[PDB]
Amino acid sequence: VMKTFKEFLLSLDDSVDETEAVKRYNDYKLDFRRQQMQDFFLAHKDEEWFRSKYHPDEVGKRRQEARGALQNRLRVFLSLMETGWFDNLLLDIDKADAIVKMLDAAVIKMEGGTENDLRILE
Amino acid sequence: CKPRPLHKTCSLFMRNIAPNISRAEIISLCKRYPGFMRVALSEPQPERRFFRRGWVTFDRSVNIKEICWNLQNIRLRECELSPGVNRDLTRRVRNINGITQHKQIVRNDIKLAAKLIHTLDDRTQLWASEPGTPPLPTSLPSQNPILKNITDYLIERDEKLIKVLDKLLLYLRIVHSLDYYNTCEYPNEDEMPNRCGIIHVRGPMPPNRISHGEVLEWQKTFEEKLTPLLSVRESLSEEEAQKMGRKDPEQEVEKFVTSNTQELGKDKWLCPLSGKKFKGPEFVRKHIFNKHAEKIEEVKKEVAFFNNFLTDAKRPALP
């Protein structure tokens, strides 16, 4: 728990200035949030989610994983273009069934799906 | 050969996954159930003690009800998973206001979609020319074939103009997981059971005449929602970093060397790393940098690990 504006001023009851009241309180705020930040780092140090978000090695992995998986989705998109799944496909509710068939055809190709695997959608 | 239903997958969902539980532990648990594919984990939520929500997905040809009941009441590090059978996506193709098909908004949406792809392709380095070899300054990235000759259509309801727009949005949605018409991203889609789940779409033609005030109102509302999706990771100021107490790389390395150069007696020095005794202060200094060259750089990583946390503006913290 953090101290309010009144509680900090109760400590220094001697030379109570007008301008220097906000000086020492904001210095307390920065040094309180310094320790609270430091206590969080030591608490959630070894956890994977925190490691993954900030650690040099682990952040290097997730950029490499995501960029690899993102390239798989691009090669799927470019395969759908040249094969011809976006030919007579408009983004309207009238062609809602055609969009669902396309998205399933995309997800098939994402999972290493062959041209034979696409035949079930017919 | 036998054609498979790769688009179809039944899956579990997990409510309580403590942050100390690794991804590898959940994969290791769910691997023994045959027809296993992959585990997804949500961004942890600070209000609920940084616990995570999970999604274990399987091949469709498997009794998901049996797997759920079998997995029921198994606790990784004394933390109950409480799995349930995840439902199928029903309302796949949602819609939004029909005004979007109007020709003035279509032109505006091509401008914005092209701007989104330009940003997202550059950020991810998606079209890298020969990614294995190193990047020279004279090297350029490969062009996106959708972005070729776009402003020709902008300058000088139309079907051919919409076909250009749809290829931009279909790219955004299939590749980067950006649902354009809803103004939202599904960032962790490739791990989740439904790889490319929900898409939003232009509604039916409006009944009444489309007012020009309502056209400008939509375009104002649309761009205000899109700009949050182009968010830069906000780094704090270098004064604020030094005020909050950013650690220096080589200072901690110097603190590491001095701490591992202890004096036993007169002309007798020892390091805890190896345990070889030397007869000088800078004898142990030259020992550590040569023999334990991997150890001193591991400290530099732990410094950057603390600094990169500090650098972030919206840090994870207690509410």
Residue numbers in the entry:
A (entry chain A): 148 to 269
B (entry chain C): 411 to 566, 600 to 762
Paper text:
Based on this model, additional constructs for crystallisation were designed in which disordered loops A (538–552) and B (568–598) were truncated. Crystals of ARS2147–270+408–763Δ568–598 (Δloop B) diffracted to 3.37 Å resolution (space group C2221) and exhibited an ordered loop A. A composite model, including both loop A (from the ARS2147–270+408–763Δ568–598 structure) and most of loop B (from the ARS2147–270+408–763 structure) was artificially constructed and used for illustrative purposes since it is almost complete, only lacking residues 578–598. In mammals, loop A (538-ASEPGT543PPLPTSLPS-552) is highly conserved and proline-rich. In most crystal forms, the loop is disordered presumably due to flexibility. However, in the crystal form in which loop B (see below) was deleted, loop A is well structured in one monomer, likely due to crystal-packing constraints. Interestingly, T543 is a major phosphorylation site of human ARS2 (Discussion). Loop B (residues 566–598) is around 30-residues long in metazoans, half the length in S. pombe and absent in plants. In metazoans, the first part of the loop is highly acidic (566-EEVSAEEEELLG-577), whereas the second half of the loop is proline-rich, particularly in mammals. Elution from the resin shows that ARS2147–871, as well as various loop-deletion constructs used for crystallisation (ARS2171–270+408–763, ARS2147–270+408–763ΔloopB and ARS2171–270+408–763ΔloopAΔloopB) are all retained by the NCBP3 bound to the resin. Nevertheless, despite extensive co-crystallisation trials, including with the loop B/‘EEEE’ helix deletion mutant, we have never observed any electron density corresponding to FARB bound to ARS2 in a crystal, and all our biochemical evidence suggests that only the C-terminal foot is involved.
ARS2 is a direct interaction partner of CBC and together they form a platform for the assembly of co-transcriptional complexes that determine the fate of diverse RNA Pol II transcripts. Our structural analysis shows that ARS2 is made up of two regions, residues 147–270 and 408–763 that co-fold into a structured core with an intervening glutamate-rich region of unknown function that is likely unstructured. The human ARS2 core has an unusual structure comprising a largely helical ‘body’ from which project N- and C-terminal ‘legs’. We find that the RRM domain is required to bind RNA, whereas a basic patch in the C-terminal leg of ARS2 mediates the interaction with FLASH.
